[PDB]
Design a protein around this ligand. Structure first.
Ligand SMILES: CCCCCCCCCCCCCCCCCC(=O)OCC(COC(=O)CCCCCCCCCCCCCCCCC)OC(=O)CCCCCCCCCCCCCCCCC
Ligand code: HEA
Ligand code: HEA
Ligand SMILES: CCCCC/C=C/C/C=C\C/C=C\C/C=C\CCCC(=O)O[C@H](COC(=O)CCCCCCCCCCCCCCCCC)COP(=O)(O)OCCN
Ligand SMILES: CCCCCCCCCCO[C@@H]1O[C@H](CO)[C@@H](O[C@H]2O[C@H](CO)[C@@H](O)[C@H](O)[C@H]2O)[C@H](O)[C@H]1O
Lengths: 58, 227, 84, 43, 98, 514, 73, 105, 79, 259, 144, 46, 49
């Protein structure tokens, strides 16, 4: 391995106004969407499960 | 039992409950005095137009208001700990009785000589007899000899309960797997009531304790007739 | 103690490597010998259905409800005894 | 503290409406439930 | 026994961390990491309070060991005095972006 | 813009505001739960059902008031807003982890609502003792939902505490020592040290309860050799420090409010105030078995817990007298905030003194698990903690919002709440001396009179709560913008205006060493 | 027409304080004395008087005749 | 600390500084009213003459009000102090708050 | 032979509120004594004291569960 | 522009996804324990890993790539890590308390003795002694790693850190094998309960520490650490010595004294 | 005169009796005659009329001590409103008693209580002070 | 960057006092009503 | 200029006091609340056995 820290420092310091979590480029946005979709979808699912569990299934 | 509009403790039925009453009176006197002093000082600080807003020296006064309370605590702790060690002294009981908590009723076992045991359930309100107390009466009372030292042993066969009789100064938790001991001595005959004192589920409110204190000779005949 | 060795002039990488290879790994290799030696199966004890063991107040959330998570048929009996 | 006069004053009439709507928002749902307690118990 | 391959702060530190390390070598403190030392505080010898704008909050610990700090905005212009001990402060505005 | 600001926040003020909104919503749930308790008790006979439903309501009441109302408001809400402003810091040490402490609470609250919706609820008491809380006497999901709710609230406050301690040790001006920070900052750091040490013990104990319920462990089950009493030690080893956690940030706000409305530049006896809060925090870790005096503990153990518990009166009495000494000579301003603080001094003292009565294990045998304990703790919590919160809310609302309350309405609200809480709780002393137990849906007929009066009190407090909502509405509806505030030279949090800009102390304060 | 005399002008707050704190202490001893007579002594004397001639067998006989017991008719 | 006479002399000296500036005048009065006393006439006298050198009539009047306020319910103090200040009031043409109507609510 | 039993006397090895070990110890002692007597061909009646004490102290369900477990071979104490 | 040395963090979604993932895991364990389904739990485990991965990636971005970690930032992280470790020590304390409470007064159900009747403990001189020498060795090799790093020696840093991780992994495998081989299980009364819960939380912390060391390994491969600035590696070393010390207490208490 | 929010960081005016000389004058800007009055103030104050003296005071300060310390009738509104809302609370309790609470247990009926009270006395409930102590067992009546 | 100043540092609008009243009512009212509905749900179950 | 309290104070105080006293009196005495006062000096004991 050679030291490529300087290229990363230039990438993450680019003055493009992006928050750090998206500053890596297109892959950051994809991973974010996957994460937030699983969190929101999975939270809706937990509410459905709570609704199901709230009634006797006799 | 408690009577309507009661303010303080049920009248004491055992010499220990009597000590607790006198010790509470001594403590409450100290409580009323401190909180009157605080309310009074408050009103004193707030009722003048004279001011003094510059930096105030703290060391002199912190002595008084640290040593005064320490001394007062000591004047509480001394009689408190004397009574603690009293309720713990050796006494030689004439009788041992066990009570097991259950959901939701007490059972009692008197197995010094014979195998005597029975369950004790609240009288439902719709079956009270005229003059009987809602939530307090049981079908089978805990009959015990008056004027004698009795060892009570308390445990549970399911969840926690707690076996209490305010008149005698008693409350011992009922814990499955454990055998807790307390001593009971009534100075008088009569009927003494208590209620389960650890949350134990749907009928926690509805599993009372009623002791029936009578002369030894009546106790022996009752024991015999319950076998 | 001081343990029983010596160095201390300066505590550097060289000293700590000296201790990794000269003391720590050899102790591991010794304990490894010692263990891979006292290994191989010890006989399973007679089954006795003691009520304080093999507790089941609720079926486990996997398998048939009755098998612990790292059930070893050879040495873990079920509450009715060792398996076929 | 000093402060400016209200930018959007709330007259006595407006405070009476805000206060009434506030108390109703607490009283009516709980009142509805408690009033119907007997239909719930025996159901 | 030993060789290299590990970058130093001199080679690789960047952004604000590098600025603070480069200022520290010059004996300078643009990011306010050190407590400034008081002058005598008189009107001829006021504490000099650097700022990047035209006012800054000062806290004055009037005597050593006071637990109470006295806080006030110090404005560009004539020296102002601590409202509790009277010690003088003067704002010296501007610069920072080297 | 909206999502970035309010869901992705890394700003101490906005996160402080989220906690205040959350704790205000919890407060409504808590109050409703307390009114159901008192509607059942306001007449003899059975209103709601047997003890299960009644104690589900009692359990939820306590968990909501403690974990979702008082802690988020005092530590999350006031601590986040004020602590960085009071030390001239630009934010918290960990501004993004700060946001996770907040967001862990709505799901913690959801798990608690869930536990009451499923099966028959968790009717266990907020102490969640086994075996009642075990998988036989509370089969099904309610108690596990309750444990997981506490695990989330635990994690939230542990990460909170690490954030506050670090921020307060590390982010002061380089000239400011710890003995130049205001008392409220002290109170939050000390509270945070208690959270840090006590919550992990609770987490261990409720994890053992979770495994007793679902993995066939038997930590608290005598059939496997365990001991129900063990859970009580683990729980109260946390639960006693928890009660000091609920009141300490309250003591810090009281010191600032009394100082401010007395027109003083500083509290009387600062170092005695600091010493007292550290001593209380320390002593708070060695007294827990005063919650266990009837479980059958040896006599010398009961003698030690009685004496060590009493000693807390000493540092606590220092504080009370120092508050009085701060009033002394003041140019007293009778703001609604000052009235809440003066009520706090008196009513907290009363509840502390009935705590000293319970500390005597001999008399506690008779008072334990009766309404005398309920009277003690509602004086320190629903008068103490609550009056501190209301005093701090009316005092700092103009800083957080840039708008004033109508002070006459806020004084009317105080007078209602004062009458309602005292009418609720004062007669419970009589019910406790005369033997009424805790956690009862019904009582023998002799206890009717005090229960009826106590229920009427609670309805008076409901009216004050409803009025508070309307008072907040009125302030935001009329928009009276703050112009000047006095004593800024000794109250640094006001010095950036009202409300302060989003970014404050971007240029730090100047403080020289001399 | 006559000059007004010089009044005390210093320590007015400390002087009011000292006067009322001494007041509060005297009141406190007055209350401690009252309370030991109306509550504490009254209690000890109620118990002492009740028991000095108490006959427990006779107490039981009245209870038993009034029909209150399960074990004694 | 110090005797009463040394406290007063220090305050007299403070206000008697010929080139006392407006800031020192205010600081000296705002500090002085934090103490548990009503200032001696000779202190108030030195503060009124300092008002005169600063050409500030209104603050001379305000200083008389604050003497009256520091006395709280001790109503004999203010009339005694005004009595002792009369030759200074007369010499400097300071009217009291009462002669100005500024004691009306 | 030295009788008139009223109840178990105070026993200084178990002076505290928890008396669980007092019950257990006398239950063990009784059954150890009865086994030693029924071994060496002898009189079980010298064991009688322990039986009286544990009967006075021990909840009937504990005795009964311990008796079933001794009959099943699952009693975990050493007899 | 700021003129203090502290880090104002960009607004971030990871606190919210981390909180939701905590809801999904806990409602998921509930689902699993009572409604026979693993679905929520697996989604919660997944979003939790994703959150941790991005959150810590972003801390790396802010420090190594963006330079936000001035000495005052770094000093705050030191305090945070020390406090965190203190909270984990108290968590273990409550399990040690459970263990001593049950073993010091063994109740009649157990036979009134410790170990309980029918429990046959591991011999503490066999694999438990091997484990102890493993984790003590890995405290020596990680200290060699730290000194190499400070001395600027890339190759011996990677070699010592690799040796440290291999020993963590060996510990983990030895322990998995010992779990399988043990004749007593979690359901064997308070013996199995205290044994498996205390050693199992310990083993989880060994996995967590090994993961953190592996992260430091790859960051060092990528040259992220300077000979003077390397807080991630220090935090992982502190945590690692914590895990070793907890093991010494378990070994002495549960395996040796409790056998 | 007009105070502005964007003035927060500047020294400001306040009427407080413990801070009698505030950091700025109440009125900073002066009209033509107010400027002539400030010049006149530099000469002997005996030459100033009462009106001029008052007007100098009102330039420097907003309210006098008597004004800023005055009492108000606010207490009437506060005590009266609190009683009004406390009275409104009783409306809630009347509704609850009418619509929510059902009949109380039969043990509170007058004949039950009379019998229960007898039985409490026959069992000598609280015979030392609390209850039966207040009954006279010789005259068969409550002690007067 | 964000709006600063009174009425702008909060997640809810105070532009219109009546819309604000409705929002505050839904917000506090939902919290207050919930335990009564949960008690109701529990009674209606068994 | 008289403020709100000068103009309305006396009325708020008189009406509030009167309303509060009347509605609490009505609530306490006319709607069937069981206060359960002490029987001491009030109840004539009656044969129960
Ligand atoms: C709301 C219902 C009230 C019911 C009244 C009782 C009826 C008497 C019947 C008719 C009387 C007939 C005679 C029978 C005597 C039986 C003696 C007994 O058995 O003995 C035991 C009793 C004796 O107690 C009492 O003797 C009543 C206590 C009254 C204390 C004064 C405060 C009263 C304030 C005003 C009303 C309360 C609401 C606000 C209270 C504020 C919180 C303190 O039981 C208690 O322990 C309760 C005390 C609780 C401990 C907290 C104490 C701290 C209080 C604060 C100090 C305030 C200082 C200044 C004084 C405070 C000035 C404001
Ligand atoms: C902080 C704690 C707290 C508070 C404030 C309260 C408030 C009240 N509680 Fe209590 N309560 C407990 C904690 C608390 N409680 C605990 C721990 C238990 C024991 C649980 C158990 O046994 O397991 C308990 C038990 C308990 C019982 C005993 C039940 C039993 O044993 O059967 C009763 C009975 O009357 C009771 C009543 C009330 C009442 C009427 C109030 C009322 O005074 C409430 C009135 C409303 C308020 C005080 C809210 C005001 C403020 C807000 C919502 C803040 C607004 C915020 C902003 C504006 C930012 N509670
Ligand atoms: C804010 C919360 C809070 C606070 C601060 C405290 C403070 C104190 N508490 Fe309490 N307490 C609770 C909340 C709190 N408590 C709760 C929720 C419960 C029940 C838990 C449950 O079971 O659900 C409870 C239960 C509880 C019990 C157990 C009773 C039982 O269940 O049987 C005890 C016993 O010792 C106790 C004691 C004390 C004492 C000595 C203090 C001391 O810190 C108080 C010290 C203060 C003072 C003493 C007043 C000021 C001092 C002076 C003016 C000086 C002069 C005074 C003297 C010389 C005495 N409390
Ligand atoms: C190899 C060493 C590494 C340990 C990790 C092991 C893998 C399994 C899962 C992860 C467990 C980690 C957490 C600790 C939890 C408790 C039990 C785990 C210790 C363990 O693995 O014990 C096993 C039982 O596991 C069981 O039940 C397993 C039960 C599996 C379900 C996991 C329990 C989930 C609930 C945990 C809730 C966590 C609460 C944490 C709150 C944190 C505080 C805020 C032992 O197997 P056995 O067959 O009984 O005996 C061996 C017989 N031959
Ligand atoms: C603990 C906090 C609560 C304290 C007490 C709250 C006071 C309640 C306020 C009024 O609540 C309303 O009361 C009505 C009756 O007064 C109910 O109408 C009910 O009764 C009516 C008339 O008798 C019918 O007209 C309606 O259809 C019927 O639903 C109505 O639903 C309910 O919202």
């Amino acid at each position: 391995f050679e030291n490529r820290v300087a290229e990363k420092q230039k990438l993450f310091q680019e003055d493009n106004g992006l928050p750090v979590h998206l500053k890596g480029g297109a892959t950051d946005n994809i991973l974010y969407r996957v994460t937030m979709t699983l969190c929101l979808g999975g939270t809706l699912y937990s509410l459905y499960c709570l609704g199901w569990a709230s009634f006797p299934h006799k | 039992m408690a009577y309507p509009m009661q303010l303080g403790f049920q009248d004491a039925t055992s010499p220990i409950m009597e000590e607790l009453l006198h010790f509470h009176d001594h403590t409450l006197m100290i409580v009323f005095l401190i909180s009157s002093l605080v309310l009074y000082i408050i009103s004193l600080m707030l009722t003048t137009k004279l001011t003094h807003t510059s930096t105030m020296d703290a060391q002199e006064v912190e002595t008084i208001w640290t040593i005064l309370p320490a001394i007062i605590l000591i004047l509480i702790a001394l009689p408190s700990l004397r009574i603690l060690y009293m309720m713990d002294e050796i006494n030689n009981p004439s009788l041992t009785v066990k009570t097991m908590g259950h959901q939701w009723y007490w059972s009692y076992e008197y197995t010094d000589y014979e195998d005597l045991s029975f369950d004790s359930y609240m009288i439902p309100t719709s079956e009270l007899k005229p003059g009987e107390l809602r939530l307090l009466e049981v079908d089978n009372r805990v009959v015990l000899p008056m004027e004698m030292t009795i060892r009570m042993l308390v445990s549970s066969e399911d969840v926690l309960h707690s076996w209490a009789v305010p008149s005698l100064g008693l409350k011992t938790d009922a814990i499955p797997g454990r055998l807790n001991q307390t001593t009971l001595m009534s100075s008088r005959p009569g009927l003494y009531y208590g209620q389960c004192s650890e949350i134990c589920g749907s009928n926690h409110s509805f599993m009372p304790i009623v002791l029936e204190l009578v002369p030894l000779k009546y106790f022996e005949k009752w024991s015999a007739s319950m076998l | 103690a001081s343990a029983a060795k010596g160095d201390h002039g300066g505590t550097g990488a060289r000293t700590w490597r000296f201790l990794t290879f000269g003391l720590a790994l050899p102790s591991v290799a010794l304990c490894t010998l010692n263990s891979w030696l006292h290994s191989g199966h010890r006989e399973r004890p007679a089954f006795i259905p003691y009520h304080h063991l093999r507790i089941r107040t609720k079926p486990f959330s996997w398998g048939d409800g009755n098998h612990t998570f790292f059930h070893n048929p050879r040495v873990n009996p079920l509450p009715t005894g060792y398996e076929k | 503290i000093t402060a400016k006069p209200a930018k959007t004053p709330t007259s006595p009439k407006e405070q009476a409406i805000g206060l009434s709507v506030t108390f109703l928002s607490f009283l009516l749902p709980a009142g509805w439930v408690l009033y119907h307690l007997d239909n719930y118990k025996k159901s | 026994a030993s060789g290299g391959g590990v970058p130093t702060d001199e080679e690789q530190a960047t952004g604000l961390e590098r600025e603070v390390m480069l200022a520290a070598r010059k004996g300078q403190d643009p990011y306010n990491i050190l407590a400034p030392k008081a002058t005598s505080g008189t009107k001829e010898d006021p504490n000099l309070v650097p700022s990047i704008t035209n006012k800054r909050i000062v806290g004055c610990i009037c005597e050593e060991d006071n637990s109470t700090v006295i806080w006030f905005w110090l404005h560009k212009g004539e020296a102002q005095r601590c409202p509790s001990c009277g010690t003088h402060y003067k704002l010296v505005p501007h610069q920072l972006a080297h | 813009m909206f999502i970035n600001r309010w869901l992705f926040s890394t700003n101490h003020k906005d996160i402080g505001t989220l906690y205040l909104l959350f704790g205000a919503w919890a407060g409504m749930v808590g109050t409703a739960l307390s009114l159901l308790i008192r509607a059942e008790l306001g007449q003899p006979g059975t209103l709601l059902g047997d003890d299960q439903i009644y104690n589900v309501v009692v359990t939820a009441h306590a968990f909501v008031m403690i974990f979702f109302m008082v802690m988020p408001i005092m530590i999350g809400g006031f601590g986040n807003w004020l602590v960085p402003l009071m030390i001239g810091a630009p934010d918290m040490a960990f501004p993004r982890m700060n946001n996770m402490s907040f967001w862990l609470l709505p799901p913690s609250f959801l798990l608690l609502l869930a536990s009451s919706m499923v099966e028959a609820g968790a009717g266990t008491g907020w102490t969640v003792y086994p075996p009642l809380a075990g998988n036989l006497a509370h089969a099904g999901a309610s108690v596990d939902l309750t444990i997981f709710s506490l695990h989330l609230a635990g994690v939230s406050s542990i990460l909170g505490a690490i954030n506050f301690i670090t921020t307060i040790i590390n982010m002061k001006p380089p000239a400011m020592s710890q003995y130049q920070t205001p008392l409220f900052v002290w109170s939050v750091m000390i509270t945070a040290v208690l959270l840090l040490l006590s919550l992990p013990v609770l987490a261990a104990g409720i994890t053992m309860l979770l495994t007793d319920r679902n993995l066939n462990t038997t930590f608290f089950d005598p059939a496997g050799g365990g001991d129900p009493i063990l859970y009580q030690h683990l729980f109260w080893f946390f639960g006693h420090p928890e009660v000091y956690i609920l009141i300490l940030p309250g003591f810090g706000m009281i010191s600032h409010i009394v100082t401010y409305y007395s027109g003083k530049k500083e509290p009387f006896g600062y170092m005695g105030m600091v010493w007292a809060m550290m001593s209380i925090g320390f002593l708070g870790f060695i007294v827990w078995a005063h919650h266990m005096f009837t479980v059958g503990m040896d006599v010398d153990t009961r003698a030690y817990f009685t004496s060590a518990t009493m000693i807390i009166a000493i540092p606590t009495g220092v504080k009370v007298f120092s508050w009085l000494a701060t009033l002394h000579g003041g140019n007293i301003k009778w703001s609604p905030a000052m009235m809440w603080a003066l009520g706090f001094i008196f009513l907290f003292t009363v509840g502390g003194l009935t705590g000293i009565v319970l500390a005597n294990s001999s008399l506690d045998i008779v008072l334990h698990d009766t309404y005398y304990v309920v009277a003690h703790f509602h004086y320190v919590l629903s008068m103490g903690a609550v009056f501190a919160i209301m005093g701090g809310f009316v005092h700092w609302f103009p800083l957080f919002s840039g708008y004033t309350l109508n002070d006459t309405w806020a004084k009317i609200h105080f007078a209602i709440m004062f009458v309602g809480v005292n009418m609720t709780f004062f007669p419970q002393h009589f019910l406790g001396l005369s033997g009424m137990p805790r956690r009862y849906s019904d009582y023998p007929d002799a206890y009717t009179m005090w229960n009826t009066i106590s229920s009427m009190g609670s309805f008076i407090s409901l009216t004050a709560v409803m009025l508070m909502v309307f008072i907040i509405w009125e302030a935001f509806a009329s928009k009276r913008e703050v112009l000047t505030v006095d004593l800024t030279t000794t109250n640094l949090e006001w010095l950036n205006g009202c409300p302060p800009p989003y970014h404050t102390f971007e240029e730090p304060t100047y403080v020289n060493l001399k | 027409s006559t000059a007004l005399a010089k009044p005390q002008m210093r320590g007015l707050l400390a002087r009011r304080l000292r006067f009322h704190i001494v007041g509060a202490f005297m009141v406190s001893l007055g209350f401690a004395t009252f309370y030991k007579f109306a509550v504490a002594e009254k209690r000890k004397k109620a118990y002492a008087d009740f028991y000095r001639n108490y006959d427990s067998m006779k107490d039981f006989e009245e209870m038993r005749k009034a029909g209150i017991f399960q074990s004694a008719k | 600390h110090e005797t009463d006479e040394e406290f007063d002399a220090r305050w007299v000296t403070y206000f008697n500084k010929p080139d006392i500036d407006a800031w020192e005048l205010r600081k000296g009065m705002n500090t002085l009213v934090g103490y548990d006393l009503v200032p001696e006439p000779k202190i108030i006298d030195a503060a009124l003459r300092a008002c005169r050198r600063l050409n500030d009539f209104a603050s001379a009047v305000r200083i008389l009000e604050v003497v009256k306020d520091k006395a709280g319910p001790h109503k004999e103090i203010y009339p005694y102090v005004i009595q002792e200040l009369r030759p200074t009031l007369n010499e400097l043409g300071i009217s009291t708050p009462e002669e100005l109507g500024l004691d009306k609510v | 032979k030295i009788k008139n039993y009223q109840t178990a006397p105070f026993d200084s090895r178990f002076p505290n509120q928890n008396q669980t070990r007092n019950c257990w110890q006398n239950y063990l002692d009784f059954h150890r004594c009865e086994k030693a007597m029924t071994a060496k061909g002898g009189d079980v009646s010298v064991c009688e004291w322990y039986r009286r004490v544990y009967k006075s102290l021990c909840p009937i369900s504990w005795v009964s569960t311990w008796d079933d477990r001794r009959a099943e071979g699952t009693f975990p104490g050493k007899i | 522009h700021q003129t203090h040395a502290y880090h104002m963090v960009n607004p971030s979604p990871w606190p919210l996804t981390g909180a939701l993932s905590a809801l999904l895991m806990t409602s998921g364990l509930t689902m699993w324990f009572h409604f026979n389904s693993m679905t929520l739990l697996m989604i919660g485990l997944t979003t939790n890993m994703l959150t941790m991965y991005q959150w810590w990636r972003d801390v790396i971005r802010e420090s190594t790539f963006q330079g936000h970690h001035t000495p005052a930032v770094q000093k705050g992280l030191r305090y945070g890590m020390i406090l965190f470790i203190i909270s984990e020590v108290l968590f273990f304390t409550g399990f040690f308390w459970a263990f001593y409470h049950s073993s010091l007064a063994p109740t009649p159900e157990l036979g009134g003795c410790w170990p309980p009747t029918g429990i046959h403990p591991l011999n503490p001189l066999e694999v438990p002694l091997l484990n102890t020498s493993v984790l003590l060795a890995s405290g020596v090799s990680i200290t060699w790693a730290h000194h190499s790093l400070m001395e600027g020696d890339r190759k011996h840093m990677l070699q010592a850190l690799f040796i440290t991780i291999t020993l963590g992994v060996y510990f983990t495998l030895l322990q998995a094998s010992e779990y399988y081989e043990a004749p007593f299980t979690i359901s064997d009364g308070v013996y199995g309960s205290t044994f498996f819960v205390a050693t199992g939380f310990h083993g989880l912390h060994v996995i967590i520490g090994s993961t953190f060391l592996i992260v430091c390994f790859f960051r060092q491969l990528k040259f992220h650490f300077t000979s003077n600035h390397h807080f991630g590696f220090e935090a992982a070393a502190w945590y690692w010595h914590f895990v070793d010390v907890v093991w010494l207490f378990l070994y002495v208490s549960i395996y040796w004294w409790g056998s | 005169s007009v105070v502005k929010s964007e003035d927060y960081a500047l020294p400001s005016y306040v009427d407080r009796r413990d801070y009698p000389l505030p950091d700025v004058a109440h009125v900073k800007n002066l009209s033509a005659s107010q400027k002539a009055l400030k010049e006149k103030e530099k000469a002997s104050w005996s030459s100033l009329s009462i009106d001029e003296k008052v007007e100098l005071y009102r330039l420097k300060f907003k309210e006098s001590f008597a004004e800023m310390n005055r009492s108000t009738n606010e207490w009437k509104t506060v005590v009266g409103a609190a009683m009004f809302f406390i009275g409104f609370t009783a409306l809630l309790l009347i509704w609850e008693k009418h619509y929510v609470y059902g009949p109380i247990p039969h043990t509170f009926e007058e004949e039950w209580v009379a019998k229960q009270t007898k039985r409490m006395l026959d069992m000598k409930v609280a015979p030392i002070q609390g209850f039966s102590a207040k009954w006279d067992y010789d005259k068969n009546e409550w002690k007067k | 960057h964000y709006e600063e100043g009174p009425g702008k540092n909060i997640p809810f609008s105070v532009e219109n006092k009546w819309r604000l009243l409705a929002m505050m009512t839904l917000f506090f009212g939902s919290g207050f009503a919930a335990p009564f509905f949960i008690v109701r749900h529990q009674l209606l179950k068994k | 200029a008289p403020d709100f309290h000068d103009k309305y104070g006396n009325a708020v105080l008189a009406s509030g006091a009167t309303f509060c006293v009347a509605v609490w009196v009505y609530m306490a005495t006319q709607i069937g609340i069981e206060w359960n006062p002490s029987p001491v000096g009030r109840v004539t004991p009656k044969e129960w056995r």
